[PDB]
């Protein structure tokens, strides 16, 4: 289960810079 890795939050914040 993803807990340490939060794909939802991480990729969103990351999508601001890296789409």
| Residue found under tokens 């990351």 | 14
Sign of CA dihedral 13, 19, 8, 12: positive
Q: Please give the torsion angle defined by the CA atoms of residues 11, 14, 16 and 19, in that order, rounded to the nearest 10 degrees.
A: -70
Choose among 5, 11, 6, 8: nearest CA to 19: 11
DSSP helix/strand/coil, 13: helix
> Which single residue is written with the structure tokens 């999508």?
15
* 3 membership: H or E segment, kind and range: none
User: CB count, 10 Å around CB of 11?
Assistant: 11
């Amino acid at each position: 289960p993803m807990a340490r890795n939060k794909p939802k939050i991480l990729k969103r914040i990351l999508a601001k810079i890296f789409k």
